[PDB]
């Protein structure tokens, strides 16, 4: 009712309790309702505190569209919310997008779903230029080309990154691009250039601290 | 008294009952013919319990009397509240050098647990004195002799309010420079009370 | 030449020798205190030592009344303690003269610190190394404690103390503030809050006292008072009945 | 009456469409006895003019005080100044000394160099703030020009049409007053260049 | 010593000691910077002796923070780091 | 050198500069002057050491009584003690000017401590090297405050200075158990001569002279009196009555 | 204290001169090299910068070289903050001249007036002067162009080619033998660029470390024109003069 | 000069005409008599409008600097003693009746300022030459528990009574609404009681009706 | 009677610089790390707040104050040395063109007048200099945004992206590596977090790291619905939660 968390946590358990459609109609009604603060992420209501709860509702859409195979509709939901994330504080733009892929890459999805929405961030990168977010998505974009078994497009993205890495450091992102580059040259039967990729990755590992998931791989 | 400031005094008075003192005044603000402020309340607060009437210069009682509050916090805040004569003597000093420019009389009636309701009245000349009760102002000219005849020493609560209300009623009706509603204040050990009287009350007595 | 024992110049270590001796020993008085904040009120407790039979306990105090809502906590040399006290009381009345409201914590703490920072500019006049802590209860924001350091450092403090045992009481209070995730004490009934702060004080000391051996005061809403000899003794006896 | 009115003369200023018209007379003297036929009230530094009306003690001598802080603005900022910005220094200088204030109301007229919006300014001798979109004048004969441009000026007039309006109103206003007359010079304020045109009027 | 280096020694000597699962050094790991192996080796000493005084078998998280005062800062004269106070 | 002797504008590790410590030795080398705080009033004591028969008794009085309601006495250096007297009596005259009331003892104490703390801040200003003992009667009751040469002052039921400061106050605590509030202060006047007589054992050189200037809560009620005539020799003979030799 | 730590460096030192003037020459040596040149068609004024980085932004570009008037410029060698006090101070005295005679002031009037400002600190007041050396460049209707150079000691001498900062005697030697009575704007710049390359330890000469503002006679008209060249125009000077690095 | 104000429960509203009259002839048809101390406090005054900014701009800027000084909110009563002691130093030789109203951390306040050193308070306040015309209307229709919409029509009709009954008022009316919860609302040209139409016969002076002697261009820069 | 010491500060050592200034940079290296950048789409002023006690609340401490709505400022080293400057700057700016004109002078010449007083503290007898260096950004009229570094001498430093404080040499090179024609407002925040936060250690939260942006004008900061002749207070500071939200984007 008044508290937006009452209609949220109750609808969160409706997934296993009844079905997907029972909990889906609740989130559609919570979109245009329960104004909070700051700017309007819905456009019919202002979202500041509910934006964290609205992200949870978007994560609940990952239980429906991704499992059933409706991601073609979810693929168009991200650019709809992209224009909304350009109104309020932009700190949530990268934070929400970072949590979308984790649920998106679990189910054995289709390559066209992520490629099309990743190009939308590339098309949006012309007006608003973000070198940190575009290169972060390019790491997972080249991973799709690894499953696509096309190494020509995956190398072109890395070559543009390695050219900028000579004048930069990007130590957390420098190990990841070399870690994925080793997967490209290994399936091509190369024991030399593939080994040189992990060689430069271990150099930056001794300077700063890389995360456990990166050091393990 | 200078140009641009409203003349204080007119109808004012205070009476010391058994233990305490009751200040009173009417509500009017006039420069020569008009009423600028009809809610006017004439009071001066140097302390929670100790109050003072607002007389003489209007600009001085809203500034110099607040300057006395400045000098009062260099003593009271360090130790404690002094007697009534201590705070009333500052009115004599600040008006002594400005006597050739700022001319303001002040009637000081305080409350204390020992000296009780002793009143210290300072005329326009800027001299401190000691009187049990005093009445001043240009609008109270009618009630001067009225309070000096039937007055009784150490009245009760309601009898003192009536003694002041019956007196202030003559200055409101029979004067054109004094009028409005009577706003009193109760000074005693029980606390500080505020009362207001309607024109239909003191008119019929 | 180069020594700060008379004049004041920048040392090769980047730290003034006067600032050192001011920060080193503030405990030459050999006294401790504590300051905590309740919900709508503020409770301060200071140790008191009376090494004579001829001393009037009502005269000796480290807590002076500034405004009606404002207390103060001072530790250091006695003659230099009243130098900042007489100035703060004179500056507290200047707020009403200029404004006519009650002195907020963000002003009185800033004025005394800025006045102490001018002493860094003036080489002839001596600064004060006395601990200055201004405690009061704000109307809008509630309780607030700002400790003014002799070098000009002042910031928000949920709790503060003096002496070498300041860090010992801080450890016990940090664990209680971490679980509750609140800076002040949400518990009402300040009469029981005074006994709550004594418990943390006994852990650092380990002994009891009399009614005149402890300087204790409570800053309430729109009022500040000082506990008398009977009010202090009542709390030291009543704390033994509970725990 | 007014000690600064012993000399006489006024400064008329108007506001057109992308143009500003401001003018004064050449008359200077003492009471009914004239002295200077070459005297010019309008002073210019930057892109904005400055008119001045009153006693030469506060006209020509204080002119060094205007350019005192103006040149410091020019030697430091090395840029232009908005008419609203320079007008505050005018008003503030008059209210520094309330007992001794200067009796010359200036006239300020110019075109904005940033947004390109014509604006006029300038105050009276006490420094009272008067800013409108039509005309701001000063002096003893300024009472005439208050009603002259009401039946003459029209919103959004060309610089040539505005030139004929301010000229015809000033020539007849000087004939009616003993403190104004003896020629009228008119300046046409444009975005960059300013055109000067001398006019002929009744001599005596 | 970085956070990755100090963590390896924490699980070394504490492997032979029975430790409660609710006790963790994350409070002392984040705040501490630029220390040596002596401070780490005494974590098993002072916190171990703290359990001896109270006759405690394991070592809780509270005793880890209580010993933090004597463990790291060895200066008993005046406070520490008087620069910015 | 160390900087504490030449400059008082620096900070000592013990909180008290060596220059301030030198002021303590100057006061202890003076003449012992005690004080009395009891229920009937506040009694002072002063002694004048006789260097030669050329000195005239009952002339030099180190007790400086501000008006009739506040007494004061100093020790050590004469000029530093009388410098505060001119300032203390000037602020008392300025007090009665503004407030037209007599000044209480606690209001008198803050004016003294402000001069000491201000002179220690400026390196060019020489601080006070003397101790101040002052008291009297106010609208409240008996109060006795002693101003140390460092500037620290607080509530004192007894005062001492000169030789055996803490030794002379030992007899004051003996009267606390006998009289809890002090009761009669008239007998304390005779006890004052006995306490000063205690310091006469080691300090005996030449003839001694004792003077007493007191004030009472009951008898005077704010007035001022002086011990003379029979009361002068009665207190002196009491101190010699215990030990005749 | 207030004496032993005061050595009175403003009076006569045992060397027979002022230490504050002698040691200020080293501060001038560490200061950027500013070489003034007075040509036939104008006055060439160049200056260096302190620690030019890649992200250092040049917009106003005036640090050690300012402009007092359209016909009069000024250059300083030393700490920039010390000069900024007297940069606008000479303008205040210049604007007072406008209030006085309502015309343009010759440079020779303001040269000696500012010399007594720093000299007055040594004369009285117990203050200290500035170690910044001044370079004056102006125009006149009698002497034509005027180029002067001051020093913290108060000396002023006319110089057609002057060099301050590091390698003072080294830069003036190359300009002395290469001097010519007839030099235009382009002739004086090519001689200054070759000299500044040997003053510092950097590689050749670039536009970022070169602070250059000069004056000519007229632009559209034939008199009264001066402009401070932007750093974008300084890069084009290297192309016009034929010297790249 | 007619200025009024109304203090309702949720805040205080003030209004001032845009017509300024200096002397027997109108000096300015369109101006702003409502000045600003802090963003939440708007001020008004009678007489010369420049005399107010010769004071308020000095104190109001300090109050805005006092906002970050206390780091909480600007205060209404902080502008009283500053304005009262300022007129006391100069002995109030400039006759003006100021009106200061705003919202402090305590609430809404409407204060009055007299010529010399005197300050008052009231629920509704009108000062200036046209005060007597507007004050009489405020005495007619009033009651307890006033709202925003009720306070607008009360203050608007008060100025209209002053515009019609006094020659020193006219042009339009600028109503400034100050709410406790929200920020201040300033509506310029809220009413249009005075509308001047175009003249009948258009008078256009043709080009060439003057006498031109010389011509030149004023120097700007090279 | 006060101020009897007329003699100046320490005279010239056998160096060529001033020893009072050389020791002043020691407190800067031992102070907080501050930086600044001009992206022309915004100005982000970020610094660190040192908390040496768990009982000290950082809500009262603000290292970035507001002299004028379009000008931000940040300091390093000694904290209270900047607090007294704010009290002096706002009073000198009051006597500055704020009273003279209808607008305050731009950041270029406004800081030069304030920094001129800092140099007077290094000269006149009896006053002593500070140990602090100030990074003062701002928005001018014709030149748009601005950034300037102020030494205790007071010479203006028209930089683009610079950093001071502890580890300034290592943190300055990182700013020189990332540059282009025109940056953005959000990019300057993420670059500062990958520089300021990763340079120091022990404070991972947003209460101990103060960040503010310039160029963003919210309609609620004006306080009036009247005619907006000017945009407004472009200075904006992130709250406690908004700073930690910037950390989750990297």
Swiss-Prot record, chain B:
It is found in: Cytoplasm; Nucleus. Belongs to the peptidase T1B family. The side chain of Thr-10 acts as a nucleophile, and the N-terminal amino group acts as a proton acceptor. It catalyses: Cleavage of peptide bonds with very broad specificity. PANTHER family: ATP-DEPENDENT PROTEASE SUBUNIT HSLV (PTHR32194:SF0), METALLOPROTEASE TLDD (PTHR32194). The proteasome degrades poly-ubiquitinated proteins in the cytoplasm and in the nucleus. It is essential for the regulated turnover of proteins and for the removal of misfolded proteins. The proteasome is a multicatalytic proteinase complex that is characterized by its ability to cleave peptides with Arg, Phe, Tyr, Leu, and Glu adjacent to the leaving group at neutral or slightly basic pH. It has an ATP-dependent proteolytic activity. PRE3 and PRE4 are necessary for the peptidyl-glutamyl-peptide-hydrolyzing activity. GO terms for molecular function: endopeptidase activity; threonine-type endopeptidase activity. SUPFAM superfamilies: N-terminal nucleophile aminohydrolases (Ntn hydrolases). The gene is PRE3. Keywords: Acetylation, Cytoplasm, Hydrolase, Nucleus, Protease, Proteasome, Threonine protease, Zymogen. It comes from Saccharomyces cerevisiae (strain ATCC 204508 / S288c) (Baker's yeast). Gene3D superfamilies: Glutamine Phosphoribosylpyrophosphate, subunit 1, domain 1. Its main location: cytoplasm. One of its GO terms (biological process) is proteasomal ubiquitin-independent protein catabolic process. The active site is at residue 10. It comes from the Eukaryota. Transmembrane segments: none annotated. The keyword Nucleotide-binding does not apply.
Curated annotation (Swiss-Prot), chain D:
The modification Phosphoserine is found at residue 30. GO terms for cellular component: cytosol; nucleus; proteasome complex; proteasome core complex, beta-subunit complex. It is found in: Cytoplasm; Nucleus. CDD domains: proteasome_beta_type_3. Transmembrane segments: none annotated. InterPro entries: Ntn_hydrolases_N, Proteasome_beta_3, Proteasome_bsu_CS, Proteasome_sua/b, Proteasome_suB-type. Its main location: cytoplasm. GO terms for molecular function: endopeptidase activator activity. GO terms for biological process: proteasomal ubiquitin-independent protein catabolic process; proteasome-mediated ubiquitin-dependent protein catabolic process. It comes from the Eukaryota. Pfam families: Proteasome (PF00227). Keywords: Cytoplasm, Isopeptide bond, Nucleus, Phosphoprotein, Proteasome, Ubl conjugation. There is a cross-link at residue 69 (Glycyl lysine isopeptide (Lys-Gly) (interchain with G-Cter in ubiquitin)). Non-catalytic component of the proteasome which degrades poly-ubiquitinated proteins in the cytoplasm and in the nucleus. It is essential for the regulated turnover of proteins and for the removal of misfolded proteins. The proteasome is a multicatalytic proteinase complex that is characterized by its ability to cleave peptides with Arg, Phe, Tyr, Leu, and Glu adjacent to the leaving group at neutral or slightly basic pH. It has an ATP-dependent proteolytic activity. This subunit may participate in the trypsin-like activity of the enzyme complex. Belongs to the peptidase T1B family. PANTHER family: METALLOPROTEASE TLDD (PTHR32194), PROTEASOME SUBUNIT BETA TYPE-3 (PTHR32194:SF10). This is Proteasome subunit beta type-3.
From Swiss-Prot, chain H:
It catalyses: Cleavage of peptide bonds with very broad specificity. The keyword Nucleus applies. It is found in: Cytoplasm; Nucleus. Gene3D superfamilies: Glutamine Phosphoribosylpyrophosphate, subunit 1, domain 1 (3.60.20.10). Its EC number is 3.4.25.1. The proteasome degrades poly-ubiquitinated proteins in the cytoplasm and in the nucleus. It is essential for the regulated turnover of proteins and for the removal of misfolded proteins. The proteasome is a multicatalytic proteinase complex that is characterized by its ability to cleave peptides with Arg, Phe, Tyr, Leu, and Glu adjacent to the leaving group at neutral or slightly basic pH. It has an ATP-dependent proteolytic activity. The side chain of Thr-1 acts as a nucleophile, and the N-terminal amino group acts as a proton acceptor. Present with 11400 molecules/cell in log phase SD medium. Belongs to the peptidase T1B family. This is Proteasome subunit beta type-2. It comes from Saccharomyces cerevisiae (strain ATCC 204508 / S288c) (Baker's yeast).
From Swiss-Prot, chain I:
It is found in: Cytoplasm; Nucleus. There is a cross-link at residue 108 (Glycyl lysine isopeptide (Lys-Gly) (interchain with G-Cter in ubiquitin)). Gene3D superfamilies: Glutamine Phosphoribosylpyrophosphate, subunit 1, domain 1. One of its GO terms (cellular component) is proteasome storage granule. The keyword Ubl conjugation applies. Keywords: Cytoplasm, Isopeptide bond, Nucleus, Proteasome, Ubl conjugation. GO terms for biological process: proteasomal ubiquitin-independent protein catabolic process; proteasome-mediated ubiquitin-dependent protein catabolic process. The proteasome degrades poly-ubiquitinated proteins in the cytoplasm and in the nucleus. It is essential for the regulated turnover of proteins and for the removal of misfolded proteins. The proteasome is a multicatalytic proteinase complex that is characterized by its ability to cleave peptides with Arg, Phe, Tyr, Leu, and Glu adjacent to the leaving group at neutral or slightly basic pH. It has an ATP-dependent proteolytic activity. Present with 7060 molecules/cell in log phase SD medium. Belongs to the peptidase T1A family. PANTHER family: PROTEASOME SUBUNIT ALPHA/BETA (PTHR11599). This is Proteasome subunit alpha type-2. It comes from Saccharomyces cerevisiae (strain ATCC 204508 / S288c). The lineage of its organism: Eukaryota, Fungi, Dikarya, Ascomycota, Saccharomycotina. The gene is PRE8.
